[PDB]
Amino acid sequence: ELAYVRDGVIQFEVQQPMIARDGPHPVDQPVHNYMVKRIHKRSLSAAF
Amino acid sequence: PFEIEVLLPGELSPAETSALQKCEGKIITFSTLRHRASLVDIALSSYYINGAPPDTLSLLEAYRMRFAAVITRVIPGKLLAHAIGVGTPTPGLFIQNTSPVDLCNGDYICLLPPVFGSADSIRLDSVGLEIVFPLTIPQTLMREIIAKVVARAVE
Amino acid sequence: PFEIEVLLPGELSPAETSALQKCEGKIITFSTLRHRASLVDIALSSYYINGAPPDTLSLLEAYRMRFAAVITRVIPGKLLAHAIGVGTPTPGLFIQNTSPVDLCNGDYICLLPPVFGSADSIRLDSVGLEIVFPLTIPQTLMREIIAKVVARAVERTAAGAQILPHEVLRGADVICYNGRRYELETNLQHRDGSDAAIRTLVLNLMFSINEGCLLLLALIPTLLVRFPIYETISSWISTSSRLGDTLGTRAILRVCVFDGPSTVHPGDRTAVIQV
């Protein structure tokens, strides 16, 4: 039923680590990431 | 309660650590407020205007520009200190009298560089810097002194 | 939370202890802070200096050095209060309006000695002391009040000093706030406090200004197209700094009204927040 799609969606989530050093500088904090991707549509044709 | 942390350099001599521990309720200053800081800003070297130790009138302006903080209990490794300028709740705050003049109840405190005899201060040979602590007098003493230094200035 | 108790005296006459209950949301001032205190510190007897009753300068000065506190409730044999000092989290703090000018929300509270009219206060003849309460108005009006009363006093000396009075004028000085004209001091006569408490006030203020815009005229003669000359400078600076420190403006409270009437009239009580 690919005729009725109109820009469906896909997404995924990641997170990266951190390391403590404790020097004369600010402190670290854990950070996460969120992204969303879209879809593209293309046709195909042939005659007879 | 906002407190700032002062990093003590390692390899410090026990004699200097003992002398540093005696400075318990003195006032220090900071150029930029932050939780973690070093010792080079507390040193007199950070007061340098052009390339040299600062002048009195220059210190009068450095005291206004820079933030202020009060020292609290010191551990062998760290030097905790609390800020006074910005609005923050701080219970049980005690300061050490540094002026040769006595204070009494209901007295406003000001801040001025040492204009009396050579100011006592901690000296750090291994680190190579020397920190100096500001002097605190009441308000009336502040106005009388200021009027006299400017009179001598225009003279 | 820190609270102060003012020990009520014995053998109090009923009319006296009753009128003490009428003033519940009134602020008092304590020389030194303690959980227990007598009455003499609250009375004017502890307030006068050099034996003579205090003047406005001593009033303004002592208001700074001395600490303030607010009365909360009254017991037939006990009187307590709450402090506005170190860090006391006083809950449900309410105060009474002692000034003829109304207050609104978001107005800051500052103190003044009574200058407009006679000071209304309780008087205990049985014990021999009386308790005067300071006047409170918003900050945006204070500077205008002090400037007007001194201007009113200096214009009186000028009329008396000049051989001919320069009477021609605009009418009567009137302060306005929230669309209400106060119209202080209708008559010329009845010099109640003309030179009674503000006597030494106009003296120091007129001399510094005289010394002020004269020292400039006597240092650079190019503004308009034996002698120390420095000790005068140090003296003027010391005086002008001290006088400016005394006549200061510092807010002590903020009127924060929740589910209540915004505007309050003289006599009404309202809840305030510690600034």
Three-state SS sequence of chain C: CCEEEECCCCCCCHHHHHHHHHCCCCEEEECCCCCEECCCCCCHHHCCCCCCCCCHHHHHHHHHHCEEEEEEEEECCEEEEEECCCCCCCCCCEEECCCCCCECCCCEEEEECCCCCCCCCEEECCCCEEECCCEEEEHHHHHHHHHHHHHHHHHHHHHHHCCCCCCCCCCCCCCECCCCECCCCCCCCCCCCCCCCCHHHHHHHHHHHHHHHHHCCCCCCCCCCCCCCCHHHHHHHHHHHHHHHHCCCCCCEEECCCCCCCCECCCCEEEEEEC
Phi-psi region of C21 (alpha: psi -120 to 50; beta: other; left: phi over 0): alpha
Q: Which residues in chain A are contacts of B35 at CB distance < 8 A? A: 26-27
Contact status, residue C113 vs residue C60, Cβ threshold 8 Å: yes
Across B11-128, the runs of DSSP E, i.e. the strands, are: 27-30, 36-37, 67-74, 78-83, 121-123
Q: Which residues in chain C are contacts of B153 at CB distance < 8 A? A: none
**Interchain proximity B7–A27, CB inside 8 Å:** no
Contacts by residues C185-188 (CB-CB < 8 Å, ≥ 24 positions apart) = C185/C116, C185/C152
Contact status, residue A2 vs residue A40, Cβ threshold 8 Å: no
Q: Which two tokens stand for residue B90?
A: 């701080």
d(CA C241, CA C236) in angstroms, rounded, equals 8
DSSP 3-state of B142: helix
**Interchain proximity C241–B106, CB inside 8 Å:** no
Spatial CB neighbours of A4, under 8 Å, sequence gap ≥ 6: none
CA distance A22 to chain B (A): 9
The one-letter amino acid code at B66 reads R
**Interchain proximity B38–A27, CB inside 8 Å:** no
Identify the residue among B93, B105, B108, B155 best suited for mutation to test binding to C, counting C beta carbons within 10 A and taking the highest: B105
CA distances from C124 to B52, B95, C11, C30 (A): 67, 42, 12, 19
For β-strands C36-37 and C67-75, DSSP reports them as: unpaired
Q: Identify which of B128, B121, B119 has the alpha carbon closest to the alpha carbon of residue B12.
A: B128
- Identify any residues that bridge with C30 across adjacent strands, giving them in sequence order: C67
DSSP 3-state of B155: coil
Containing A32, the helix (H) or strand (E) segment is strand A31-38
Give how far the C-alpha of residue C122 lies from the chain's centroid of Cα atoms, to the nearest Å.
17
Tokens 């420190």 sit on residue? C245
Q: Which residues in chain A are contacts of B10 at CB distance < 8 A? A: none
Contact status, residue B133 vs residue B19, Cβ threshold 8 Å: no
CB of B38 within 8 Å of a chain A CB? The answer is yes
Total count of residues recorded for chain C: 275
Provide the edge-to-edge strand list for the sheet that holds B27-30: B27-30, B67-74, B78-83, B3-7, B36-37
DSSP 3-state of B17: helix
DSSP 3-state of B14: helix
Contact status, residue C253 vs residue C273, Cβ threshold 8 Å: yes
Total count of residues recorded for chain B: 155
- Resolution of the structure, angstroms: 3.7
The one-letter amino acid code at C261 reads P
Query: Which of A24, A26, A27 minimises the CB distance to B38?
Result: A24
For β-strands B27-30 and B36-37, DSSP reports them as: unpaired
CB of B34 within 8 Å of a chain A CB? The answer is yes
Burial of C256 (0-12, 13-18, 19+ CB in 10 A): middle
The one-letter amino acid code at A27 reads V
d(CA A19, CA B107) in angstroms, rounded, equals 49
CA distances from A11 to A35, C11, C220, C221 (A): 6, 84, 78, 80
